[PDB]
Amino acid sequence: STIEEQAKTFLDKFNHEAEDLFYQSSLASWNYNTNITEENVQNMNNAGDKWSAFLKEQSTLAQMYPLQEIQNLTVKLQLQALQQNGSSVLSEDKSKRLNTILNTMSTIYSTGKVCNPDNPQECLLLEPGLNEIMANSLDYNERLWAWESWRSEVGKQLRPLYEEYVVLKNEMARANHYEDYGDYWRGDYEVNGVDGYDYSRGQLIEDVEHTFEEIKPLYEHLHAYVRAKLMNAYPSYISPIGCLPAHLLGDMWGRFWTNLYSLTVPFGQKPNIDVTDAMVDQAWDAQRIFKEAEKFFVSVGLPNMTQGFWENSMLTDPGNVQKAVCHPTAWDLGKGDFRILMCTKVTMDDFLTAHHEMGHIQYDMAYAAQPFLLRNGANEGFHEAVGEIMSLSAATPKHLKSIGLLSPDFQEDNETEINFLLKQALTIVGTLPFTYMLEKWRWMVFKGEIPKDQWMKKWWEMKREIVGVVEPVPHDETYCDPASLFHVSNDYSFIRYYTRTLYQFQFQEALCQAAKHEGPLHKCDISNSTEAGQKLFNMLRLGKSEPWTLALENVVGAKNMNVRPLLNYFEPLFTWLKDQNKNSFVGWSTDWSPYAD
Amino acid sequence: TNLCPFGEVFNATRFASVYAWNRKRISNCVADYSVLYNSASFSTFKCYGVSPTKLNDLCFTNVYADSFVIRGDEVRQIAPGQTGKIADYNYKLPDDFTGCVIAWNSNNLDSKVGGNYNYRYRLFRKSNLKPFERDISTEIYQAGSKPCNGVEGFNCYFPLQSYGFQPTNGVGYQPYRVVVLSFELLHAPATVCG
């Protein structure tokens, strides 16, 4: 006869009906990803709409239970994720204009083709087309053509659509009692109802720009070493005083610097660590990569994989009779069915990925006891952090020598640990200002902090200040450069790639001090130690039922988001990077430009 | 002399659901329980009160065999002194139970592609069950004080929710057929022993 009695009764109707619709919306979505066919594209749209319409009838029923009268914090976490109207607060014209834009904004990004209208040979696809020319080319104009003429049509036919996308999603969040839409994406990190652990949506901006004041002395030395090594490749294009040009960072936007490792090696005469020539000679197949990735998680205390994991998941490209989008995604279908979908090959980059996409499944298997609305990570960048601490442990030469892959007499010296860290600094440290600046840009375009005339002037003013990247030729306001990225056009949150970095070293320093390691953090390993994986499983099993400040205190002991483990990881590199930068110019100047003539 | 018809309780082609579990009064036959240990196909064989060795030395008056189909992680609720959505609303065993509980996987007979929605269970009951009480009822569960005259609406839910049995489910969601033998001694003559 009380509201908290009817709330648990309603959620028992929800959890025993949404679980039977989320499985049929995921199994039908699995049948499309394995079979790209004209029949299976509608079965993920007919059965996918049965759950898209189910969450609208329950969101109109759950709002009859007020959240001021319930005192159980478990029910208030499931009802807060259910009473949110989302895009239902708009009219019929605005909700139809939003779905028309989102089905078209993702279309011009994917189906935007680049050709030279004067030469017949200069036409290519995107992957493995335009991604190849922007990664492994050693010319300046061959990269400039793939960078300016890529945003000459995709960065121009996405400007008036994203301009209307700002005013459409601001009314979606102003009627949901949020401030802006930028305050709606910081509502995942919000914690209310717990005393002492209250995390506001506005304290995420106070924490992200406070974590960047410690990672900036590290990035300024990584940038000054990459720029000084680009002088030997382009001696007549880059000045060694100012900033870097945009199309020389590795790919189309400059997010990851992974492809810049092949030109800026610290020591080239040293043998690079690799198991690709030790997996083909030992005759490894698509099963042995996951049979050796399973023994990593059993050795720390996490359970074995299910029997339905090995008969239903797709690991090998199934010939030419069927086409499958086999980008690596770990599939949690619900109802105890856990699969995985990737095109595996015998290489180290797919051996560390098999550790990365099985660490997602060992997270989805851990919160299976939770109710349906609490079966997710503690925040958005919390699921991708526990999946990548396994990639940081399966790449060390203590694990590659333990499974017989690496040589038994492979010498580890001072000059080997740097060459592994600079491969990791371009992928982890180098993407940190690029992840923070784009989310600094979206949170300042949704707050109304810019007018229309400085829409593209205040984006390159931030690339020349945060990431230290200039433009080769200037872009006017008719251009729109950030919409060329996947997460801006398809409207994904991008701060989940900034907090997974700061959490994956808070976790690894917590899982190496539990495994009793004596030495630097990058040579550490968590396998063959049950007292470290049982530390993590007390956090993996919580799901969303606990706030993320108490899930960090379960493994680390600090409710905040800290930097000091990440500076302790790259401390043997940052010591070397200071000693290599006595003659260079640590820091950049905004006044330089390649077209400043 | 005849054998006990255990070939109609264990090898039945279509079992029952746990809200409307069947019950077969097995009496006046020479029951052979020694081929039940040696079958090696039952995932759970727990005997409460009696022993697997004492089951061929003692004779019981009535042997009731209750058969139903439940989930994977709800087999543990079929035990004397458990609670949940099965041991309180569907099939409650008494605290002084004196029988054996069979349980085995039946994914290749009770699961079809797309869903086998023939097995149901009580999700909402206005009280708890007495031990060994079965009540088939389709009454709309009044979860408030509105009231509701049959129309399933706001805070008046249908109690019989169906099982989503599929062949690609997990171990804890696959259908486990369960037979519960409930031995007892009464004040009648007894002739059920091996």
Coordinates of C-alpha atoms in Angstrom, one line a residue, chain B residues 44-182:
Chain B
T44 CA 21.1 -32.9 -9.7
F45 CA 20.2 -35.8 -7.5
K46 CA 19.7 -34.6 -3.9
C47 CA 18.0 -36.8 -1.4
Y48 CA 16.7 -35.1 1.8
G49 CA 15.8 -37.2 4.8
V50 CA 16.5 -40.6 3.2
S51 CA 19.8 -41.9 1.9
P52 CA 20.7 -43.3 -1.6
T53 CA 21.7 -46.6 0.1
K54 CA 18.6 -46.8 2.4
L55 CA 16.2 -46.3 -0.6
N56 CA 16.2 -50.1 -1.3
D57 CA 15.9 -51.3 2.3
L58 CA 12.8 -49.2 3.3
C59 CA 9.2 -49.4 2.1
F60 CA 7.0 -46.4 1.9
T61 CA 3.2 -46.0 1.8
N62 CA 2.8 -43.2 -0.8
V63 CA 5.5 -42.0 -3.3
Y64 CA 4.3 -38.7 -4.9
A65 CA 6.1 -37.7 -8.0
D66 CA 5.8 -34.0 -8.9
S67 CA 7.2 -33.0 -12.3
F68 CA 7.7 -29.5 -13.7
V69 CA 10.1 -27.5 -15.9
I70 CA 12.1 -24.6 -14.4
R71 CA 15.1 -22.5 -15.2
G72 CA 18.8 -23.4 -14.6
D73 CA 19.5 -21.3 -11.5
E74 CA 16.1 -22.0 -10.0
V75 CA 16.8 -25.7 -9.4
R76 CA 18.4 -24.6 -6.1
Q77 CA 15.1 -23.1 -5.0
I78 CA 13.5 -26.6 -5.1
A79 CA 14.9 -27.5 -1.7
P80 CA 13.5 -27.5 1.9
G81 CA 13.9 -24.0 3.2
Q82 CA 14.5 -21.9 0.1
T83 CA 12.9 -18.6 -1.2
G84 CA 12.5 -16.9 -4.5
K85 CA 10.0 -16.7 -7.4
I86 CA 9.5 -20.5 -7.4
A87 CA 9.8 -21.7 -3.8
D88 CA 7.3 -19.1 -2.6
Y89 CA 4.8 -18.6 -5.4
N90 CA 4.9 -21.8 -7.5
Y91 CA 6.2 -25.0 -5.7
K92 CA 7.1 -24.9 -2.0
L93 CA 8.7 -27.9 -0.4
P94 CA 8.1 -28.3 3.4
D95 CA 10.8 -27.7 5.9
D96 CA 10.8 -31.4 7.1
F97 CA 11.0 -32.8 3.6
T98 CA 11.7 -36.5 3.4
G99 CA 12.2 -37.2 -0.4
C100 CA 14.5 -36.9 -3.3
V101 CA 14.8 -34.2 -6.1
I102 CA 15.7 -35.1 -9.6
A103 CA 16.9 -32.4 -12.1
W104 CA 18.4 -32.7 -15.6
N105 CA 18.9 -30.5 -18.6
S106 CA 16.3 -30.6 -21.4
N107 CA 17.6 -28.0 -23.9
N108 CA 17.1 -30.3 -26.9
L109 CA 13.5 -31.1 -26.1
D110 CA 12.1 -27.9 -24.4
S111 CA 13.7 -25.2 -26.4
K112 CA 12.9 -24.2 -30.0
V113 CA 14.4 -21.4 -32.1
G114 CA 12.4 -18.2 -31.7
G115 CA 11.1 -19.2 -28.2
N116 CA 9.2 -22.0 -26.5
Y117 CA 6.6 -20.0 -24.6
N118 CA 4.5 -22.9 -23.3
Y119 CA 6.1 -23.0 -19.8
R120 CA 4.9 -20.3 -17.3
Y121 CA 5.3 -19.4 -13.6
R122 CA 3.7 -17.4 -10.9
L123 CA 5.4 -14.0 -10.8
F124 CA 2.9 -12.2 -8.5
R125 CA 0.8 -13.8 -5.8
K126 CA -1.0 -11.9 -3.0
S127 CA 0.2 -14.3 -0.3
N128 CA 2.8 -17.0 0.0
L129 CA 2.2 -20.7 -0.6
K130 CA 1.6 -23.4 2.0
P131 CA 3.8 -26.4 1.4
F132 CA 2.6 -28.7 -1.4
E133 CA -0.2 -26.3 -2.4
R134 CA -1.0 -25.8 -6.1
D135 CA -3.5 -23.1 -7.2
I136 CA -4.0 -22.5 -10.9
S137 CA -5.4 -18.9 -11.0
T138 CA -5.5 -16.3 -13.7
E139 CA -6.6 -13.4 -11.4
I140 CA -5.1 -10.0 -12.0
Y141 CA -2.7 -9.2 -9.1
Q142 CA -4.0 -6.0 -7.4
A143 CA -0.8 -4.4 -6.4
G144 CA -2.5 -1.3 -5.0
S145 CA -5.9 0.0 -3.8
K146 CA -7.4 1.3 -7.0
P147 CA -9.1 -1.5 -7.6
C148 CA -9.0 -3.2 -11.0
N149 CA -12.0 -5.1 -12.5
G150 CA -9.9 -7.5 -14.6
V151 CA -8.4 -4.9 -16.9
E152 CA -4.6 -5.4 -16.8
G153 CA -3.4 -1.8 -16.4
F154 CA -1.6 0.4 -14.0
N155 CA -0.3 -1.6 -11.0
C156 CA -2.5 -4.6 -11.8
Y157 CA -0.4 -7.2 -13.5
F158 CA -1.0 -10.6 -15.0
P159 CA 0.7 -13.2 -12.7
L160 CA 1.5 -15.9 -15.2
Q161 CA 4.7 -14.7 -17.0
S162 CA 6.1 -17.1 -19.6
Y163 CA 9.6 -18.6 -19.9
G164 CA 11.7 -17.5 -22.8
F165 CA 13.3 -20.9 -23.6
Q166 CA 15.7 -20.8 -26.6
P167 CA 18.5 -23.2 -27.6
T168 CA 21.2 -20.5 -27.5
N169 CA 20.6 -19.5 -23.9
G170 CA 23.1 -19.9 -21.1
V171 CA 23.4 -22.7 -18.7
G172 CA 21.5 -20.8 -16.0
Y173 CA 18.6 -20.1 -18.4
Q174 CA 18.2 -23.5 -20.1
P175 CA 15.1 -25.6 -19.1
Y176 CA 15.9 -28.1 -16.4
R177 CA 13.1 -30.7 -16.1
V178 CA 12.6 -31.5 -12.4
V179 CA 10.9 -34.5 -10.8
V180 CA 10.4 -34.3 -7.0
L181 CA 9.7 -37.7 -5.3
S182 CA 8.1 -37.1 -1.9

